[PDB]
Design an enzyme around this catalytic site. Sequence first.
Site, mmCIF file in Angstrom:
data_model
loop_
_atom_site.group_PDB
_atom_site.id
_atom_site.type_symbol
_atom_site.label_atom_id
_atom_site.label_comp_id
_atom_site.label_asym_id
_atom_site.label_seq_id
_atom_site.Cartn_x
_atom_site.Cartn_y
_atom_site.Cartn_z
ATOM 1 N N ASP A 1 0.911 -1.398 0.203
ATOM 2 C CA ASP A 1 -0.330 0.132 -0.078
ATOM 3 C C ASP A 1 0.682 1.245 0.234
ATOM 4 O OD1 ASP A 1 -2.023 2.149 0.900
ATOM 5 O OD2 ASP A 1 -2.580 1.644 2.574
ATOM 6 N N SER B 1 -1.138 15.736 -12.184
ATOM 7 C CA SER B 1 -0.766 15.468 -13.829
ATOM 8 C C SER B 1 -1.480 16.509 -14.545
ATOM 9 C CB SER B 1 -2.459 15.030 -13.457
ATOM 10 O OG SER B 1 -2.436 13.963 -14.993
#
Length: 330
Positions: free
Chosen positions: A35, A199
Site C-alpha cells: 500500500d 498530473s
Amino acid sequence: STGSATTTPIDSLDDAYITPVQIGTPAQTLNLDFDTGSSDLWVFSSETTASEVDGQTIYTPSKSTTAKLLSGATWSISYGDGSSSSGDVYTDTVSVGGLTVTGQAVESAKKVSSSFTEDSTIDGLLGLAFSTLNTVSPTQQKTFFDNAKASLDSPVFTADLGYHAPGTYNFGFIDTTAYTGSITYTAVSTKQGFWEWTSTGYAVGSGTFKSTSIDGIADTGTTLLYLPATVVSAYWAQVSGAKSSSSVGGYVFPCSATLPSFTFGVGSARIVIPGDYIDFGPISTGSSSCFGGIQSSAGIGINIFGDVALKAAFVVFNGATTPTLGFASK
C-alpha cells in the site's frame, strides 16, 4: 541488493493485490497488500481477537526465534474506506522477493474491523508511503522500503500491476524490459506523507486532451481512480445511461455499455487506461447495473490515482533524497 516479488489480484475484479512476504525465523509467509498510501506493516496474528479472524494466515511471533517485542509500542490506523486495525509491535526479519530487512517493525493486530475479517485473502498490509505517516507510538517506525533503502542498488521500488493478471513489485532496480518507450519522471511532494504529484490533464476516449493540473496520490492500496467531480462527469457523460447513484455510492453504468478509455497526463507524456479497466462489474450478483472504476474524489479531500490508473503503467517510486515518480506505458 534487490528484491522481486509477484503480486496477484485477490479476485476477478482486481479489487486489491497480494504479495507474499516472509516474516520471522523459520519464515512465516503471509500475503500482504502493498500500500503506497500508508506506512504501517501490520499482520493478522496469534494475538488477533479470535472472532475477527476468518481464514487469514496469521503471524505467530512466539514461533519466531528472531521476534522481539517492541516494549510499550502500540499502533492504530484508520483507512480512507473506513476500515481500521490496531495492536502492539514486534521487530523481526522480513523478506520480500529475496530482499531481507532485519529489525523491521511488524505490527501485530489485536483488533481488525469487519472489512478485514471478511476478506480471507489479505493477511495484512505493507505500507510503502513515507515513514512520517507510520502510526506506532511512542516511537514512530520505518517502512520496509525506508529500512531497505541504503542497502538497495538504487533507492527505488517499482509497481507493475496487472489487469486481471499477476504483476510485479521490484526493489532496488528498474527492469528496462518491463515497459515500452521511456519513463517520464514528475515531482513529488512529501508534505502529507504520500507519493503526491500533479498530473498535467486528461482526455476521455478519442477526445481532445484537457490541460489542467490535478494534484493527487499514487496509491496502490486504493482500488479505483478518484478525480475531481468535473473530470468524472465529463468521463461518464460519454457512456449512455451512466449516472451517479447516491444509493449505490457512485457512478454506475449499464453493463451492456462499451466504456471509453481515459488518458491522464504525466508531464508531456500520456498514460491510457483502456475502457475495460474501468468496469467493476454488477453492483450486486445478477444486476445489469455495473459499478464504475472512475469516481469522484469530492469529500475525500484528495485525488487518488489508485489501481485503475496505476495498472495501466509501469510506475517508479524513486526514494532518492528528493523523491520523484516515474510513469511509463507498457
